[PDB]
Design a protein around this ligand. Structure first.
Ligand SMILES: [Br-]
Ligand SMILES: [Br-]
Ligand SMILES: [Br-]
Ligand SMILES: [Br-]
Ligand SMILES: [Br-]
Ligand SMILES: [Br-]
Ligand SMILES: [Br-]
Ligand SMILES: [Br-]
Ligand SMILES: [Br-]
Ligand SMILES: [Br-]
Ligand SMILES: [Ca+2]
Ligand SMILES: [Ca+2]
Ligand code: NA
Ligand code: NA
Ligand code: NA
Ligand code: NA
Ligand code: NA
Ligand code: NA
Lengths: 445, 445
């Protein structure tokens, strides 16, 4: 049946995928032709942020549209026994629910990480009200399992011999699209890749091993990523394993793009590609940005963001205006013709910015007391307003001020030479910490 | 719900798989641990026959329980334009239908080859009345396509990146078993493997390449099965490609065995493993038997046959009594508590033989006029009674008589030295040819 429908929203989020990994973000070693095509057909954001440097909190910010620091989940959820924290369906109108109330059929394929209690799972995707829950974790994901049978995903009872998890998740996204082709749907495709431990089909690893050898010289893939290197992690840039895993994600995104064309849904479907936090040390490529996962330096919070909506969003555009994972909830609600019912949101509707509208300045905030990692040197809070970013560290207490425009690698601390800017950003950060009841860092007394 | 049900019947048939390929049949190069376990848990037949040396006719004999020569399909069905032959659902009560009438839910996963007209497909598995038709050919299978997307199987619209066809078919068998666990079912698992062109996942090919090298010396896999060898076919015994394809079949049979245990169906399920014709020249291993596919010599018609029915059939038994693919229809009907309604059958109920009963002698017959292959030297008819087998050839007209007990490789023709036995078998063969209206071979006038 033809006629106006509210547009499908497909949200594709990689796990721990760095800002410097995609071909569109300047990477020449990895191959992401499908994502680069999605980029040439959409708007690419160079200053997109996860609202936290770790899994659970960014996922919290997406499903609640609220500051992780306000929710009280600022660090990844560990195994059940190491935490009393979970996302409570009675405490938030989640994004899937707001879309349900706007006439959408809702689906999650894969990683939740908003409840690590599997005995009762009161805060699982089903309990939050997803119409379809497909291949979500059935136990603490931990170091992972990427090959059928998937030891972390009991609900994937059926599969083929040595089936790769990324390939499975992307096939389930295709079938979900086809089953639900006739009505508005929200599909949250929550990839386990590229979370350590790094695993990819041998032929893809062999391919990037040889490409590593061609780039660096004969034997270099064995020298740096041989049987010796058990987790395939190194200080060498260009990781054949992450490249092979990113090729499986990329080929998967191409299957979804193909399925949308075939089913006639491309013209009325919003496609977002995002990552929940910065690249992981010894695995990920955050380009020239400082540090990565678990740090509030740019490398831990800067993410690839591609938004495609054919004939609504101009193709092959680059947007430098800062945005965060808080912005998705109000953006999807505007596209769905919905209004937040009582629900308060800490993000802003991006649809006017996506349609070529002029940008508007707003302070952006982060808080990482590392309640789970206990990373004393990484414990910190941050405000960005304009090009200035202020980081407050709690162990070795200090302020760091960077001009991200002139110093995007955060290599020159300005706090001392620019005290009035420092004092002005400190006041915004302190006010925000009281507004959200920011959790004190876990340090000695 | 517990209580007596008629037993599930799972019929697993490989394409063009030779008598000498399985570990249980003496092969040390290939690895078939799951099938060898099925063998240690069932009855293994050393003198089992396909009723024809080619695909379509053997499949005809299975679904009709009638001599291929009586049906009028004695050679494989070519593409639509090269044939007016098809199996007509209005001319036979097919096996799936006889089981339906005995209270079974019926399923085919894969190859039919009983209709090559895809414009109308009047003689397809659905038209013959299978409740579930899964991954059947949507066009002439020809040289094949073993990797998703499967160019010969349009109904496999959904799949993962570079999914292997054998792995897919065996996963679909598992899900079929699970969906239908509560009621009696017949599953015809009709594998496309190991039909040329030989294709298998690289890691399995690499594995048997190295094993070939270990057996024959360094470089020998490249020497005989390198980039040079496009179809991976050779005169060398031990083919890394067929071994890798047979390992995928074997691992698949293990998944089915596992699924039956998990679902509690192993105690009330009959498992048959069979092959539709002898191993293919330049690909298959027919051990010491003469020739292979398209010949009525033992290599073209002798098949692996393992029947498992825990606590009804004695485990780890070897049965030397001759049986054929004609025997399946009446055997499955007896196990289903059914009686052929009007339908005439050319085979015999094996259930008394499977339960440890004494064997009974019966003449067995073949006719190959090669209406499709046009193989003038291979065109022939054959009778086996006891250990004596008489072959009649039409091009270079002659009788060949072999004592298969003392001469299983058919290397010593006895027709001249044993004229009275020859004349006696000639009379049975001629009578049978008139009984079934045997099609004259396609030769010059
Ligand atoms: Br219409
Ligand atoms: Br994590
Ligand atoms: Br540290
Ligand atoms: Br200043
Ligand atoms: Br202050
Ligand atoms: Br019961
Ligand atoms: Br054939
Ligand atoms: Br010949
Ligand atoms: Br004689
Ligand atoms: Br005669
Ligand atoms: Ca993550
Ligand atoms: Ca065959
Ligand atoms: Na807990
Ligand atoms: Na809720
Ligand atoms: Na696994
Ligand atoms: Na035809
Ligand atoms: Na019929
Ligand atoms: Na293919």
């Amino acid at each position: 049946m033809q006629g106006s429908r509210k547009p499908n929203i497909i949200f594709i989020m990689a796990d721990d995928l760095g800002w410097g990994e995609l071909g569109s973000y300047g990477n020449t070693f990895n191959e992401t032709p499908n994502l680069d095509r999605l980029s040439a057909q959409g708007m690419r954001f160079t200053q997109a942020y996860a609202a936290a440097p770790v899994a659970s909190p960014t996922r919290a910010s997406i499903m609640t549209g609220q500051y992780p620091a306000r929710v009280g989940i600022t660090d990844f959820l560990p195994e059940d026994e190491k935490t009393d924290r979970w996302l409570d369906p009675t405490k938030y109108v989640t994004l899937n629910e707001a879309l349900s109330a706007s006439g959408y059929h809702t689906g999650i394929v894969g990683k939740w990480h908003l409840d690590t209690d599997f005995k009762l799972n009161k805060g699982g995707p089903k309990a939050h009200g997803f119409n379809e829950v497909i291949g979500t974790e059935s136990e603490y994901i931990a170091d992972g399992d990427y090959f059928f049978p998937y030891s972390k995903i009991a609900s994937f009872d059926k599969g083929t011999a040595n089936e790769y998890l990324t390939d499975r998740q992307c096939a389930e996204a295709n079938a979900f699209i086809t089953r639900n082709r006739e009505k508005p749907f929200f599909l949250y495709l929550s990839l386990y890749s590229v979370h350590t431990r790094l695993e990819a089909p041998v032929q893809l690893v062999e391919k990037y091993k040889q490409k590593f050898d061609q780039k660096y010289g004969t034997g270099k893939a064995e020298q740096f990523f041989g049987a010796n290197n058990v987790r395939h992690e190194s200080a060498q840039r260009d990781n054949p394993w992450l490249a092979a895993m990113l090729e499986s994600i990329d080929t998967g995104v191409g299957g979804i793009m193909k399925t949308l064309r075939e089913t006639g849904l491309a013209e009325n479907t919003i496609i977002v590609f995002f990552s929940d936090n910065g690249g992981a040390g010894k695995a990920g490529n955050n380009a020239h940005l400082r540090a990565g996962k678990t740090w509030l330096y740019e490398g831990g919070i800067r993410e690839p963001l591609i938004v495609s909506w054919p004939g609504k969003i101009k193709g092959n555009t680059v947007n430098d205006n800062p945005v965060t994972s808080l912005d998705f909830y109000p953006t999807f609600l505007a596209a769905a013709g919905g209004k937040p019912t009582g629900g308060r949101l800490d993000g802003h509707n991006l649809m006017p910015l996506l349609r070529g509208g002029r940008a508007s300045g707003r302070p952006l905030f982060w808080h990482y007391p590392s309640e789970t990692g206990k990373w004393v040197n990484r414990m910190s809070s941050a405000v960005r307003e304009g090009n200035y970013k202020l980081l407050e560290f709690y162990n070795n207490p200090r302020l760091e001020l960077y001009d991200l425009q002139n110093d995007p690698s955060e290599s020159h601390n300005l706090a001392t030479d620019r005290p009035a800017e420092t004092a002005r950003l400190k006041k915004l950060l302190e006010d925000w910490k009281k507004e959200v009841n920011a959790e004190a860092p876990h340090l000695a007394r």
